[PDB]
């Protein structure tokens, strides 16, 4: 698809068998999801935004479907205002910015 | 252009007569630039994300050249670690997400 930006670019994702809404975010290096249970071990990560840095949990090689496209990669879990799909998974689904 | 997301989608902008680098950020509702002076009136605003909220100055009807495309809109000025071009101006240059 071609998604315009008059509205937030919200899509449905599937992670852990569960449907969630998430924001396609070209300003995000990484994918960050609200608190949830994921399998496997996690490692520590700090991520930063306009208001400062926060601690999150990094899970690698997580299966997630984004707007119908399968990705397998790193998912961070922590206190994010909205679920965010960042560039690490946008590249996997083949997304580009065009103008 | 068509911009891939292997790297941060940074472009050159012109604002207040100054050339700067900025991030094309589909996750941002608003455009936020590092501290600089801009002409006219402004009002205070709080904007937030991961890490919390920060106070910024809101300037309306500001013109910006974004990678060669002129646009006009609201620009927020404040302590952001990266200049961000948000959806309010990405729409004006006809930017879309494609996959």
């Amino acid at each position: 698809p071609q998604i315009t930006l008059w509205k937030r670019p919200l899509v449905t994702i599937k992670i852990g068998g569960q449907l969630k809404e998430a924001l396609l975010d070209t300003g995000a290096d990484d994918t960050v999801i609200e608190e949830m249970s994921l399998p496997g071990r996690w490692k520590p990560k700090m991520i930063g935004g306009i208001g400062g840095f926060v601690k999150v949990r990094q899970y690698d090689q997580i299966i997630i479907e984004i707007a119908g496209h399968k990705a397998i990669g790193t998912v961070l879990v922590g206190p994010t205002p909205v679920n965010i799909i960042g560039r690490n998974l946008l590249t996997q689904i083949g997304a580009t910015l065009n103008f | 252009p068509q911009i891939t997301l292997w790297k941060r989608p940074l472009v050159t902008i012109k604002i207040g007569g100054q050339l700067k680098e900025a991030l094309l950020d589909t996750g941002a509702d608003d455009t936020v630039i590092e501290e600089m002076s801009l002409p006219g009136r402004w009002k205070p605003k709080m904007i937030g994300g991961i890490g919390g909220f920060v106070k910024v100055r809101q300037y309306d009807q500001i013109i910006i050249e974004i990678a060669g495309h002129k646009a006009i809109g609201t620009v927020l000025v404040g302590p952001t670690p990266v200049n961000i071009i948000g959806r309010n101006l990405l729409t004006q240059i006809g930017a879309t997400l494609n996959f």
Partner: peptide
Amino acid sequence: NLXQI
């Protein structure tokens, strides 16, 4: 809202 590094 605005949106990480």
